[PDB]
């Protein structure tokens, strides 16, 4: 992906994190586990929701064909009518299919971005109090108990304290 | 002691297309195209259609003897006519501005 996180330096996703799209896995002396970053997650849900509704709604006004019939000596206008109706269908078929392709690409990249930013958010807190392992993980120099871990997820990790 | 960042995966086999890549497996997707129908002509919002069966609009309106079924039809939602109804003008001829009248019927 464009942002290098998903299926990049973070090799794979987690079956074990059920509760959100992005989050944290911690590991210390007390144990280990997954925790979803809800805010980053809810941001993503709001964006994708708005997108789908924007797509659906933009295609709201669109060509509706009507039945018109013509006799044996009105072939020209019958042909005109047919070419006209087919023409609009092809145009709207193109618009729909292309919008879906373009916005699918942007949706996948958007998730990649949200992961990258979450990783950097944590990196920028920890700074040189941890080893950046290069796989999505940070190994602490000090012991980091569950309250310490929570402060990382918080945005509250007190750097001068360690 | 460590903290790791990661993302969701699941057992999904749903696929989507993009400009640069086709058949990308994603964790979730939303189909937006209806592909199925019931194969029947139905009441529209409870209001039954006028099904002319073997009669045409001309046979109906002029009162072709074979089209007595439609001697006094109730309110309809839409009208259904075959491609080549057999009971059209029993006595051969023309119907002047037939198409302009059929258009009038759609209102």
């Amino acid at each position, epitope marked *: 992906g464009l942002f290098g996180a998903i299926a990049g330096f973070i090799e794979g996703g987690w079956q074990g994190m059920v*509760d959100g799209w992005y989050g944290y896995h911690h590991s210390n002396e007390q144990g280990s586990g997954y925790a979803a970053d*809800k*805010e980053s997650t809810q941001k993503a849900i709001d964006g994708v929701t708005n997108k789908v509704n924007s797509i659906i709604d933009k295609m709201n006004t669109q060509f509706e064909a009507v039945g018109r019939e013509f006799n044996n000596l009105e072939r020209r206008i019958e042909n005109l009518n047919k070419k006209m109706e087919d023409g609009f269908l092809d145009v709207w078929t193109y618009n729909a299919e292309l919008l879906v392709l373009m916005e699918n690409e942007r949706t996948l990249d958007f998730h990649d971005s949200n992961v990258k930013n979450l990783y950097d958010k944590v990196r920028l807190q920890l700074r040189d109090n941890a080893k950046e392992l290069g796989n999505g993980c940070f190994e602490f120099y000090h012991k980091c108990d569950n309250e310490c871990m929570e402060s990382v997820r918080n945005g509250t990790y007190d750097y001068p304290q360690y | 002691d460590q903290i790791c960042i990661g993302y969701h995966a699941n057992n999904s086999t749903e696929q989507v297309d993009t400009i640069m890549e086709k058949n990308v497996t994603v964790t979730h997707a939303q189909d937006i195209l209806e592909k199925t129908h019931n194969g029947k002509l139905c009441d529209l919002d409870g209001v039954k259609p006028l099904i002319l069966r073997d009669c045409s609009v001309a046979g109906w309106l002029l009162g072709n003897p074979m089209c007595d079924e439609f001697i006094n039809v109730p309110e309809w939602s839409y009208i259904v006519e075959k491609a080549n109804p057999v009971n059209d003008l029993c006595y051969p001829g023309d119907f002047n501005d037939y198409e302009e009248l059929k258009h009038l019927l759609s209102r």
Partner: antibody
Amino acid sequence: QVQLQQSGPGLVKPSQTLSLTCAISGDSVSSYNAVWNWIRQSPSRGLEWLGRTYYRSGWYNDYAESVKSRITINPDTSKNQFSLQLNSVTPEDTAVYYCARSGHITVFGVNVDAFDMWGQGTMVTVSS
Amino acid sequence: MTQSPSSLSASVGDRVTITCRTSQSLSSYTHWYQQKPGKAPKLLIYAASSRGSGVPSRFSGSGSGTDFTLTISSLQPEDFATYYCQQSRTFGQGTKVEIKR
């Protein structure tokens, strides 16, 4: 429709173990579109989520911080049920215990912890 | 999760609005339950504004930032209950709705 049928004794002596079971019908304990939870309610504490188990290419459990050291929630894939075990009970564990399914309803495939089905409840009294 | 008011009385047919103020604003993770005496809670609203299975149209939900609202457009006698909001694993304290007659 899914039904959840609870059982287990409603009387536990102080310091001993509370043991409840939720038997599922209409769904699988190991379903990828289910999470199996225990929640309790008391007039004092209100509604409190205790823990859960779920299967996603392997079994997972999460437990509430308040009970983590005392609690176990195990699936039984022979009988399609899941249990609650709560050790070293005190009077503060007196409550109505409910099992409930979550993650059946999801926003874009993400479990939101919305609990769509609940069992009938077991009233548990801690007393000698 | 803080609900307001802790209880209310209203007449049959009244419009009733209950509020839940949340520590963190997530529209998708907030739900409303209705609990009648002696019964388990039943899911009423999910993801701020979707009606739960079997829930009548007089019940609706809205969300703005950290403020969430449950509205009963026309109160019925059978809507006597305690209503709880929920984000993640946290429940509000509940609002008791009593009928006024």
